[PDB]
Amino acid sequence: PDRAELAELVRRLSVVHGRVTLSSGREADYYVDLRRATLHHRASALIGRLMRELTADWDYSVVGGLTLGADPVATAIMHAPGRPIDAFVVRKSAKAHGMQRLIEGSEVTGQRVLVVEDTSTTGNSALTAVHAVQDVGGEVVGVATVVDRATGAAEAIEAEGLRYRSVLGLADLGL
Amino acid sequence: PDRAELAELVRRLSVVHGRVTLSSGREADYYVDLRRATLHHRASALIGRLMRELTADWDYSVVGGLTLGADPVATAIMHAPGRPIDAFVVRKSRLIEGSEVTGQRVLVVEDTSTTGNSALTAVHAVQDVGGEVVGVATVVDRATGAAEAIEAEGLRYRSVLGLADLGL
């Protein structure tokens, strides 16, 4: 029921129907804004729960990713029922202070880390977080995401020796 | 107990004592890394509870502020028990992500700040889109005029913690 409850909320909240002229001059009939679910009271509590179950067999104390598409997901996982898991956010530029200048939040040095994102087209953003955690001495145990969009992300993440899992898929969006 | 236990988590996770050089060149005897608290599993859960208690007499359906500092606070409030409250995020540079703020009563959040400019930016961004801001709540007030700046704009300001809870 949860996967289906979430899947429906993602469709309703995040598939934004309506015609739009892009900067290129092409028109699209819809676009996919996952931030609308990841920041919704109900969809986020489901995301938290389901991403915990999805990764239950992985060994990690810390969850995080690349701002902003990761923050709400990571915090959802942190707040969801179960064993303690802390969070972190990889920035795009360097903090003024500390010994992990691209990483807000919890100390990832010497921890096993889950890397998350709401959705990835290329896996660029996820891998940017993976390497940022890596450069500071964190063990990335895998990457997980709310929605796979079958656009190359899995094979890009798998190419660097890392597991990839998703709660939802292209079919769950309708389209 | 909740407030006392958060205070202790904020001292232990976020108040970094020792001679330090700021980005300006100024030397301080400490700095505050409030995000280690806002991204910690226990402290964030207390933040959501306590920020909800703190603003229980205000009417708002949506909570959020300027990225990154606000997002961990906004989602802790959203995930905390009680009546449903959605979240939003004001970007620095399409300004508002997440839940709709237009036509809604909105709580602007900040983890902490010396000047309140970040809070103000979020307030202004919500106003430009037809949201009504009911006030600003923060985790830590630094007693450096943030409050009064927010009050000059006709907005109520509140904090869970203050300067004295940070043992300086």
Author numbering:
A (entry chain A): 4 to 178
B (entry chain B): 4 to 96, 104 to 178
From the primary publication:
The inspection of the catalytic sites of the protein crystallized in absence of ligands revealed a bulky residual density located in the substrate-binding pocket I of one monomer of each of the two functional dimers present in the asymmetric unit. All efforts to unambiguously assigned such residual electron density to any of the substrates or products of the catalytic reaction proved unsuccessful. Given the predominant nature of the mononuclear dicitrate species at physiological conditions and the presence of iron(III) and citrate species in the crystallisation solution of ligand-free MtOPRT, we manually fitted the FDC molecule in the electron density with satisfactory results both in terms of ligand geometry and refinement statistics. However, both approaches gave unsatisfactory results, poor fitting scores (CC < 0.7) and refinement statistics, prompting us to conclude that a mononuclear iron dicitrate is present in the MtOPRT active site. FDC is held in place by hydrogen bonds involving the non-conserved Ala99 (3.5 Å, long range H-bond). These interactions contribute to the stabilisation of the “flexible loop” of the neighbouring chain. Moreover, FDC O7(2) interacts with the amidic N- and O-atoms of Thr124 (3.1 Å and 3.2 Å, respectively), while the Oγ of the conserved Ser26 forms hydrogen bond with O1(2) of FDC (3.3 Å). Noteworthy, in our MtOPRT structure, the conserved Ser26 is shown to exclusively interact with the FDC molecule, and does not participate in either OA, OMP or PRPP binding in MtOPRT orthologs. Moreover, in order to further support the structural data, we performed thermal shift experiments that showed a stabilizing effect of FDC, not matched by either Fe(III) or citrate alone, with a KD of 1.6 mM, well below the concentration of Fe(III)-citrate present in the crystallization buffer.
The fifth step in the de novo biosynthetic pathway is catalyzed by the enzyme orotate phosphoribosyltransfrase that synthesises orotidine 5′-monophosphate (OMP) and pyrophosphate from α-D-5-phosphoribosyl-1-pyrophosphate (PRPP) and orotate (OA). Herein, we report the X-ray crystal structures of MtOPRT (coded by the rv0382c gene) in complex with PRPP, inorganic phosphate and an exogenous Fe(III) dicitrate molecule (ferric dicitrate, FDC) at 2.25 Å, 1.90 Å and 2.40 Å resolution, respectively. In all the structures herein described, both monomers composing the functional homodimeric unit are related by a 2-fold axis, with a solvent excluded surface between monomers of 1045 Å2 (13% of each subunit surface).
